[PDB]
Amino acid sequence: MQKQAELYRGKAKTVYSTENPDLLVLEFRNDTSAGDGARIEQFDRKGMVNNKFNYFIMSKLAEAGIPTQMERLLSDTECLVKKLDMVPVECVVRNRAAGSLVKRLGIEEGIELNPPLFDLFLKNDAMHDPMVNESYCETFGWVSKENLARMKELTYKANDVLKKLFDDAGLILVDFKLEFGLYKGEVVLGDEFSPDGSRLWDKETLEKMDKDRFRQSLGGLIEAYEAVARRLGVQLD
């Protein structure tokens, strides 16, 4: 299985078709966007780190029983995945207050959330990914009630699994975003899990080591990404 032609691309990955109608090639680019204003910069090794970081996390979730898109890595920046009919809704679980929650509610960053919060955002850059809820999914036909329930279920399961994984690595899983899609009628985890869409703080110093370093221009973005990879045991070289 090799890339055939580019079908489409997003702000971080390029999607290619393959000879198989049910398999695609995801290419992680070095592109790094930010804010609703959207400012993009390229960071060396970024795509490769996220691709391998994603494979590692996806496998951990699969081992836990989470059905995923993953087939296998193809190169430093590419992987083979099942073609999914993506539900255009981001699922965000928050263990501590940060990002848009802090901006939206004016709550103090870092506040522990018990139980964790669960946000749903419609994927629409034009509208800056507006917040939605279950009624919207039904009314606009984005996903069935049964499938949405499954998505939330798998997200919370992923949260339980990953909070433990990151804790063992001396990290706090502040929050993260997931995207699911349908594969032959079944809900499957797709897209990616990396520091781009998940917040990770050092357990002892609370130092931010995810995309917030880029959003807040704190410097050392990729250095932080690789630091996290090393703590988890993700081979990069």
Query: Which residues of this protein are in contact with its own copies, per CB under 8 A?
Result: 104-106, 113-120, 122, 124, 126-127, 130-136, 138-139
Nearer to its own copies, 96 or 208 (CB): 96
Nearest distance in Å: CB 233, ligand ADP: 24
Q: From the DSSP assignment, how many helices (H) and strands (E) are in the chain?
A: 6, 14
Nearer to ligand ADP, 100 or 231 (CB): 100
What percentage of the chain's residues is helix, strand, coil (to nearest 5)?
A: 30, 30, 40
Which of the ranges 10-18, 95-103, 111-119, 199-207 carries the binding residues for ligand ADP, by CB under 6 A? 10-18
Q: Which does 77 bind (CB under 5 to 8 A by kind): its own copies, ligand ADP, Mg ion, none?
A: none
- Per the rule left: phi > 0, alpha: psi between -120 and 50, beta: everything else, 106 is left
Which of the ranges 45-53, 81-89, 159-167, 223-231 carries the binding residues for ligand ADP, by CB under 6 A? 81-89
Nearest distance in Å: CB 177, its own copies: 15
Distance CA 130, CA 143 (A): 17
Specify the pairing of strand 85-86 against strand 78-82. Answer: unpaired
Nearest distance in Å: CB 123, its own copies: 12
DSSP string of 79-123, one letter each residue = EEEE--EE-SEEEEEEEE--HHHHHHH-PPTT-EEEEEEEEEEE-
Report yes or no: 55 and 44 within 8 Å, Cβ to Cβ.
Answer: no
Instruction: Show contacts with Mg ion in window 2-61 (CB under 5 A).
Output: 10
Under the binding rule (CB under 6 A), the answer on residue 77 touching ligand ADP is no
Nearest distance in Å: CB 27, ligand ADP: 9
Nearer to Mg ion, 116 or 190 (CB): 190
Nearer to ligand ADP, 22 or 138 (CB): 22
The DSSP 8-state label assigned to residue 18 in this structure reads -
Under the binding rule (CB under 6 A), the answer on residue 179 touching ligand ADP is yes
Distance CA 61, CA 70 (A): 11
Which of the ranges 38-46, 54-62, 80-88, 156-164 carries the binding residues for ligand ADP, by CB under 6 A? 80-88
Distance CA 49, CA 62 (A): 20
